[PDB]
């Protein structure tokens, strides 16, 4: 009996220059690409969020094969023969080699800035009477919210109890690799759309969408609501939590809409407790 847990999570509003890409002498370009309507949005690589989860798992017990030496800023590997039955990271994120391999039990898309990117940069000349090179750096930044989508096959896990630490990690995501010195951007969720179903396909990949450039309302996308009303994407398996709950409860006719009978909580921790109880009951933990 396969069981999955998909989720679309939207972060807060803040100033971010997280991932970046190769510089051009001047400027540290935040990487970006096209999105809905062709407007350019700033991205955050999937490997970034996977690295953040690995760091979370390492920071709180939860034995990790791929330990990150903070002092040396390098990745040391404890046991060259990966053992998913023991190491959490090989159980979840998998591994690769020249047994032979193990597909990661976690797959997440790259994070997307909810609002299109406008040309924004930060001057960076370093203090000092002497003005030599390596001064006047430019840091392209973005004042938006980041929304990313993940999916885990809990069945593929070697230890079925490892789903819960991933839930705590995604809720308390420590840090996506970024200019924390200049732009400390928290990545904790502000509005969640979770679904725990035995179906392989979940049509909730990117449901937070507002556009409306330079704004933070972050309404639920119309297409997601239409899909919910259609009959598919069963509301009983839906879990809606965060600040979007307020806007949902301020929607007209919401008391009679099919979205009403979905698990809905303003408090994020109550959502997490209820979902974890359901998952533990279904998986027999």
């Amino acid at each position: 009996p396969n069981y999955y847990l998909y989720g679309t999570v939207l972060t807060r509003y803040g100033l971010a220059s997280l991932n970046h890409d190769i510089r051009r002498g001047n400027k540290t370009i935040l990487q970006k690409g096209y999105w809905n309507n062709g407007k350019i949005h700033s991205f955050v690589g999937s490997s970034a969020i996977r690295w953040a989860l690995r760091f979370y798992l390492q920071k709180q017990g939860y034995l990790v094969n791929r330990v990150w030496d903070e002092e040396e800023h390098i990745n040391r590997l404890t046991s060259e023969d990966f053992d998913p039955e023991k190491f959490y990271d090989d159980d979840i994120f998998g591994f690769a080699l020249l047994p032979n391999q193990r597909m990661g039990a976690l797959g997440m898309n790259m994070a997307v800035s909810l609002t299109p990117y406008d040309g924004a940069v930060k001057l960076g000349a370093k203090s000092g009477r002497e003005k030599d090179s390596t001064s006047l750096h430019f840091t392209e930044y973005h004042a938006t919210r980041y929304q990313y989508y993940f999916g885990i096959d809990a069945t593929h896990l070697k230890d079925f109890s490892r789903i819960l630490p991933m839930i705590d990690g995604i809720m308390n995501l420590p840090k996506v690799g970024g200019s924390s010195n200049i732009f400390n951007y928290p990545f904790c969720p502000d509005s969640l759309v979770f679904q725990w179903t035995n179906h392989f396909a979940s049509y909730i990949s990117y449901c937070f969408e507002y556009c409306d450039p330079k704004s933070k309302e972050a309404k639920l996308s119309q297409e997601f609501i239409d899909e919910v009303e259609c009959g598919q994407i069963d509301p009983s398996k839906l879990w809606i939590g965060g600040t979007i709950v307020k806007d949902l409860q301020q929607l007209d006719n919401f008391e009679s809409s099919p979205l009403n009978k979905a698990h809905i909580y303003r408090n994020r921790n109550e959502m997490i407790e209820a979902l974890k109880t359901v998952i533990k009951r279904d998986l027999g933990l």
């Binding site: 009996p1 396969n2 999955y4 998909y6 991932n19 970046h20 890409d21 190769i22 990487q31 970006k32 690409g33 096209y34 999105w35 809905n36 062709g38 991205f43 690589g45 999937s46 490997s47 996977r50 390098i74 990745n75 040391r76 590997l77 060259e80 020249l98 597909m103 990661g104 039990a105 976690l106 797959g107 997440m108 898309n109 790259m110 989508y149 993940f150 999916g151 885990i152 096959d153 069945t155 593929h156 035995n198 179906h199 392989f200 396909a201 049509y203 990949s205 990117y206 598919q232």
Partner: protein, 212 residues
């Protein structure tokens, strides 16, 4: 002749890096038949690759996606030591955004029962019965699929961009991928033709076979 099964695909981010583009993550405009075949095998939970040879696949591309480049510190097997900095290399990889396409599956050429079309159908009527692992993805493992559902020819009732394999076309899509090197990889030359049809042209049918 039983109507071929039709699937609606919607992937937010995807990439089909080409065989010979090993220095760069530069991708095909259209999902290759090999990647689609592998993803269908993953959906039906078929680990063996030789089980469903002969199935004919046709791809209808609903909207032309945008091509964007992203940076990644991809890891490679250059030095014996894992912690050696020679393993990590910064390079660019192209992605395709907001990919919506329709897939036609014709498993009549299969010689082993049940065929792939029957397996996909039975998977969609009873999702709980099918036993598999992993999370369904197109291209790279982290590129999940937003929506894969059973759909008709009229789901968008719009205009379709088909992938017709033209001997004088531009795209060189592989229908069988040899992951180790390039010996067994087999290529076919395609083109994107804008036609208003709800059914794929014969030429658009790409039939997967073993390289032998």
């Amino acid at each position: 002749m039983i109507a071929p099964l039709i699937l609606y695909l919607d992937v937010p981010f995807t990439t089909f890096r080409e065989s010979h583009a090993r220095e760069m993550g530069k991708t095909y405009p259209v999902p290759p038949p090999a990647t689609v075949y592998g993803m269908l095998l993953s959906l039906v939970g078929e680990t063996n690759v030789y089980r469903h040879c002969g199935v004919e696949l046709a791809i209808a591309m609903l909207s032309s996606p945008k091509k964007s480049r992203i940076l990644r510190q991809m890891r490679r097997f250059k030095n014996a030591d894992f912690s050696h900095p020679e393993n990590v290399i910064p390079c660019y990889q192209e992605i395709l955004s907001n990919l919506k396409c329709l897939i036609w599956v014709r498993s009549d050429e299969e010689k082993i029962q049940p065929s792939l079309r029957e397996r996909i159908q039975l998977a969609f009527d009873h999702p709980e019965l099918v036993r598999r692992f992993g999370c369904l993805f197109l291209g790279e493992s982290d590129q999940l699929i937003k929506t894969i559902k059973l759909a008709r020819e009229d789901y968008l009732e719009g205009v379709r961009q088909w992938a017709i394999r033209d001997n004088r076309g531009r795209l060189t899509l592989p229908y069988w991928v040899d992951h180790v090197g390039s010996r067994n990889t087999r290529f076919l030359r395609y083109r994107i033709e804008e036609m208003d049809r709800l059914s794929p042209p014969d030429l658009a049918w790409t039939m997967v076979q073993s390289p032998i």
